[PDB]
Structure 1
Amino acid sequence: WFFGKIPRAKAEEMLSKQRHDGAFLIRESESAPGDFSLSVKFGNDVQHFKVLRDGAGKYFLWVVKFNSLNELVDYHRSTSVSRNQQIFLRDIE
């Protein structure tokens, strides 16, 4: 799935002819040095997602973080508070 530094338009060309939603490639972005981009076919067009990096060197596309404790709590009523177990928050009685 890794296509090196192929032009963005060529990635769109290849993916547009793909039959299945989700057909994808990783390419090296012509924008900023050292960047990676994920191009994916979805429906009638091709979408591009920047591969992000953090200070530790890790990769990610998107992460969920919260502007308030209240939003963290409400989010974890339906997503587990633990990576290793399914634990969902319920109000104290």
Structure 2
Amino acid sequence: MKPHPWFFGKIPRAKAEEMLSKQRHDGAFLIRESESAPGDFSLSVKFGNDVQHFKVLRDGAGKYFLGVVKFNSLNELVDYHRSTSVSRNQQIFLRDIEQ
């Protein structure tokens, strides 16, 4: 029985950036309802001298998850995963077969 302190309703991006930028620690964050698309949520976070925004979605079962990058081809999917790990916990980057 206690509300979520990170929840700031539907404040504009400016107010979220203007606020978070004044923080002194990497990871300073808030959850806000998206201006872009209704029903969605936006995770604003402070990092360096910038404020990054991550899209959060809620599906028909009430499950929450971060949005993921999406590609126009398998060729772009594999090449992207040459630099970014395919596994969430383990660090696995794709390499051309040898021999």
TM range (shorter): 0.5 to 0.7
2:47 matched to 1:17? no
Residue 52 of structure 1, CA deviation: 2.2
Name stretches of at least 5 consecutive residues in structure 1 with no aligned partner.
none
C-alpha spacing 1:56/1:69, structure 2 compared with 1 (3 Å): farther
Greater than 2 Å deviation, 4+ residue runs: 52-57, 62-93
TM-score (normalised: structure 1): 0.64
Tell me how large the CA RMSD over aligned residues is.
3.7
Name stretches of at least 5 consecutive residues in structure 2 with no aligned partner.
1-5
**Matched residue pairs, number?**
93
Alpha-carbon displacement from aligned partner over 1:17-62 (angstroms, at most 9, x marks no partner)? 0000000000001111111100000111000000023453311115
TM-score (normalised: structure 2): 0.60
Structure 2: distance between partners of 1:47 and 1:87 = 25
C-alpha spacing 1:66/1:45, structure 2 compared with 1 (3 Å): closer
Q: Do 2:40 and 2:58's aligned partners in 1 also have CA atoms closer than 8 Å? A: no
Q: Identity over aligned residues, as a percent?
A: 99
Structure 1: distance between partners of 2:68 and 2:19 = 29
